[PDB]
RNA sequence: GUUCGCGAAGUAACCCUUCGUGGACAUUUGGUCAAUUUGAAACAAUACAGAGAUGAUCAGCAGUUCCCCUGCAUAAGGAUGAACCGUUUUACAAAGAGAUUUA
């Protein structure tokens, strides 16, 4: 009699915004995703014309546990995943504190049925408990290779020109980009800058990084979008006995522009990886060179 | 909110408890605390 | 349901393997209820899954 | 939008061009209860797909966007779809937008509606976990999929390139030639799963690539999850977005304890 | 009879099948009966060996 | 689809209700392709 | 769409059509489920190994395990169905003797 007493485990967010709604109760549904047992399942929709049904995955007693809701996975209380709900604990307390899971098939079935509780669901089960290190989140908010030769690749780099303003290509070199950086955040600033949104769809530009290497490569379409992409970019560098080179400007981080007008494929930084390691360290001494 | 608990009215041939199925299942040691017990031959045994 | 090969036809093919416990139960339903042999032909009420 | 919101989905393949149910002919009799060929040796039954999947070209409005459909079609990704605008599902590219609402159920769920599970698999196969959030795509059968022609591994790393690149927003691209190995991570869960199952059991080679003739003849290119990154400097990176992407949470786990006081 | 047999391919058979007392087992069994029932009489007898 | 099930491919059952077998079998196909009387009575009740 | 009432038109012993209006009647299906490879039948074949006790060859029946298959089965079979026939140091002292050794 076990099976049919205890109470669903239902969040505000999955339930929706209606103010009464029919669920449907199995008594032997489907089986449990963590423990792997046979557990009362329940059907709603949140409204009554909805095109989803939603239903619940986990059983009561694996989401208590781990205080969590049946559906989400996500916390009781907090409506974040457990993957984080350690971490962030494990940095209030100087402690580490993590939620173990059961490999074996038998001893995850084992490990269900024990009422103690695991994880950071100790702490964020009691009100008193949690409310203590949120407040505690407060104060830290208040705290605030040479062998190999790399030769025939860097001739292809046109390392000596400028913003010179002209038509040229669609073609432009980026370099210092660091091991950081997705392709995505270069490319929506670009778009950004030139004001174009949604890039990818119209396929106006094209780029290639390395992140090996250190090294960018740029292609534009429909060239007059490339010199207004020029028209743009501020910050420059004049450098000493050299040619000048525009800046783009991520947050703390700083990638110089050449004109191509011959670069493309692939090979161009490097084809395997140490070759690319080699190339890093060709720049960075360039970079330091162009700095100071 | 609110809930309404409805039960499903099953097809007869389907099988019925699709989660039914035989298992051996290793119990746990019920969480109630232990209660305490209060409580020559040698060579003849 | 002459031919079964789709995954659609998986719930379908448990329901027959649920029917087979019925079957001596149609087999009686339709011997009894036979055309004798001044009738040419027989129109019964049926039910079906 | 040029591509999508204008447009109505059109029909990749009719119905009586779709596939036979039936698979090849694996041994001497086929079972019809599990749909498979007994009594003898399989044959290494996998083969590569007859059709595959055109962003520009297929993409438009369908019956789910109408209604707020959720999910996308999984035979949309496979290039399969025969119902074109009468399709339940949706029939574009996942972005910015749609994943947006796609927050709260895909958590436990994929794009195309499917329950993820708690152990990863021993090949790291179809679905993902709800353990973990793995945006990094392992790409494998690279000479299956080139049909055993030889390249140079930087040209194989663009033609990786190309054809992931309209799958969403690709953070980085690897390709190892000591081990044929791609490891392609996005911006998105949500554009992992579309593109891992368009781009299973495909071709790479082009169709000026000499080829595109027999190229049906393969095993297509493998896409399965990728493990973690064992070199150390990806690793401290990891915890690097480990530690700000908390903070971005310490920011809001206190302001709706401000919204409780 | 044939709701057991189709009971058995969907759920398995029961591992919790007790046997009985037939007549091939009868010797095996009143030996388990006998034994346990001498080591019982003797381990009441002796102090705390 | 019960013999299907089983695994018994190498069973045949033709349309006038005969259980025929194909092949030579097997120790361990003969022990697993034994069929209890509650099949073979309900097979020759749909031969009546 | 039907019907009741109302307001008009044309025909008109107020009747038949048609247009404009009020009320009535009838009221929320279905999904735990999307159509080949990546969320999971099996066997056969091949290769290796070989089916209890014992000096040796054999009838067997049990019990123990987070072991099953066949069978309607609490029957009976499945190598006497299978796996078990390996490893084992402290509730610990009493008596004495030598030697070392210190207020
Ligand atoms: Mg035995
Ligand atoms: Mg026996
Ligand atoms: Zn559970
Ligand atoms: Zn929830
Ligand atoms: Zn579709």
């Given at each position: 009699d076990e099976i049919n007493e205890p109470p669903p485990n239902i969040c505000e967010q999955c339930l929706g915004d209606e103010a009464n709604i029919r669920m449907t109760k199995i008594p032997q549904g489907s089986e449990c995703k963590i423990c792997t047992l046979p557990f009362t399942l329940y059907h709603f929709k949140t409204?009554?014309?909805?095109?989803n049904i939603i239903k619940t995955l986990i059983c009561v007693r694996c989401a208590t546990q781990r205080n969590?809701?049946?559906?989400?996975?996500?916390?009781?209380?907090?409506?974040?995943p457990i993957q984080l709900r350690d971490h962030l604990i494990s940095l209030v307390n100087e402690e580490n504190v993590m939620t173990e899971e059961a490999k074996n098939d038998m001893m995850k079935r084992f490990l269900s049925l024990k009422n103690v509780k695991l994880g950071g669901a100790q702490i964020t089960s009691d009100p008193s408990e949690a409310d203590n290190i949120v407040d505690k989140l407060k104060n830290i908010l208040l705290r605030?290779?040479?062998?190999?030769?790399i030769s025939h690749i860097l001739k292809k780099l046109p390392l000596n020109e400028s913003?010179?303003?002209?038509?040229?290509?669609?073609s432009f070199f980026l370099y210092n980009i660091d091991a950081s950086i997705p392709e995505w955040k270069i490319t929506d600033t670009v778009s950004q800058l030139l004001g174009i949104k949604k890039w990818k769809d119209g396929n106006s530009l094209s780029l290639i990084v390395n992140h090996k290497a250190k090294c960018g490569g740029l292609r534009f379409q429909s060239s007059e979008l490339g010199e207004r992409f020029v028209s743009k970019i501020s910050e420059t560098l004049v450098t000493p006995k050299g040619l000048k080179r525009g800046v783009l400007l991520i947050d703390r981080f700083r990638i110089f522009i050449i004109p191509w007008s011959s670069g493309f494929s692939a090979?161009?930084?490097?084809?395997?990886t140490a070759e690319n390691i080699k190339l890093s360290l060709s720049l960075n001494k360039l970079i330091q060179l162009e700095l100071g | 909110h609110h809930i309404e608990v409805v039960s499903k009215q099953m097809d007869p041939l389907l099988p019925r408890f699709v989660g039914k199925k035989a298992r051996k299942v290793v119990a746990p040691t019920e969480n109630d605390e232990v209660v305490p017990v209060l409580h020559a031959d040698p060579n003849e045994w | 349901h002459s031919d079964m090969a789709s995954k659609m036809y998986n719930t379908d093919k448990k329901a027959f393997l649920g029917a087979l416990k019925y079957l001596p139960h149609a087999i009686l339903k339709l011997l009894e209820n036979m055309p004798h042999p001044w009738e040419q032909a027989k129109e019964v009420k049926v039910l079906y899954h | 939008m040029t591509s999508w919101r204008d447009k109505s989905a059109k029909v990749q393949v009719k119905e009586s061009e779709l596939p036979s149910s039936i698979p090849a002919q694996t041994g001497l009799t086929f079972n019809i209860w599990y749909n498979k060929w007994s009594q003898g040796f399989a044959g290494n039954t996998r083969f590569v797909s007859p059709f595959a999947l055109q962003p520009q070209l297929h993409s438009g409005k369908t019956r789910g966007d109408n209604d707020g459909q959720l999910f996308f079609c999984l035979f949309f990704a496979k290039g399969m779809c025969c119902l074109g605008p009468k399709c339940e599902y949706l029939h574009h590219i996942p972005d910015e937008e749609d994943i947006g609402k796609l927050a709260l159920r895909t958590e436990v769920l994929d794009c195309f509606g499917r329950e993820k599970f708690a152990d990863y698999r021993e090949d790291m196969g179809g679905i993902g976990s709800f353990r973990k959030k793995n945006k990094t795509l392992y790409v494998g059968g690279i000479d299956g999929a080139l049909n055993s022609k030889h390249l140079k591994p930087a040209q194989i790393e663009s033609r990786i390139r190309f054809v992931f690149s309209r799958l969403g927003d690709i953070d980085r691209i690897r390709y190892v030639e000591s081990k044929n190995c791609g490891f392609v991570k996005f911006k998105y869960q949500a554009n992992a799963e579309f593109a891992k199952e368009a781009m299973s059991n495909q071709t790479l080679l082009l169709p000026s690539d000499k080829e595109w003739d027999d190229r049906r003849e393969g095993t297509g290119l493998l896409v399965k999850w990728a493990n973690e990154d064992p070199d150390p400097a990806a690793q401290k990176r990891l915890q690097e977005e480990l530690k700000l992407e908390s903070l971005n949470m310490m920011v809001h786990l206190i302001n709706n304890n401000t919204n409780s006081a | 009879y044939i709701g057991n047999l189709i009971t058995r391919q969907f759920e398995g058979r029961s591992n919790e099948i007790v046997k009985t007392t037939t007549k091939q087992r009868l010797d095996a069994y009143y030996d388990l009966e006998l034994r346990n029932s001498v080591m019982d009489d003797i381990l009441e007898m002796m102090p705390e060996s | 689809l019960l013999i299907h099930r089983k695994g018994l491919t190498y069973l045949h059952l033709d349309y006038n209700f005969n259980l025929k077998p194909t092949k030579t079998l097997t120790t361990k196909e003969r022990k697993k392709s034994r069929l209890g009387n509650s099949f073979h009575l309900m097979r020759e009740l749909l031969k009546m």
């Open positions: 409204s009554k014309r909805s095109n969590i809701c049946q559906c989400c996975m996500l916390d009781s209380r907090w409506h974040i605030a290779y040479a062998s190999v030769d913003f010179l303003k002209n038509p040229s290509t669609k090979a161009s930084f490097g084809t395997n | - | - | - | - | -």
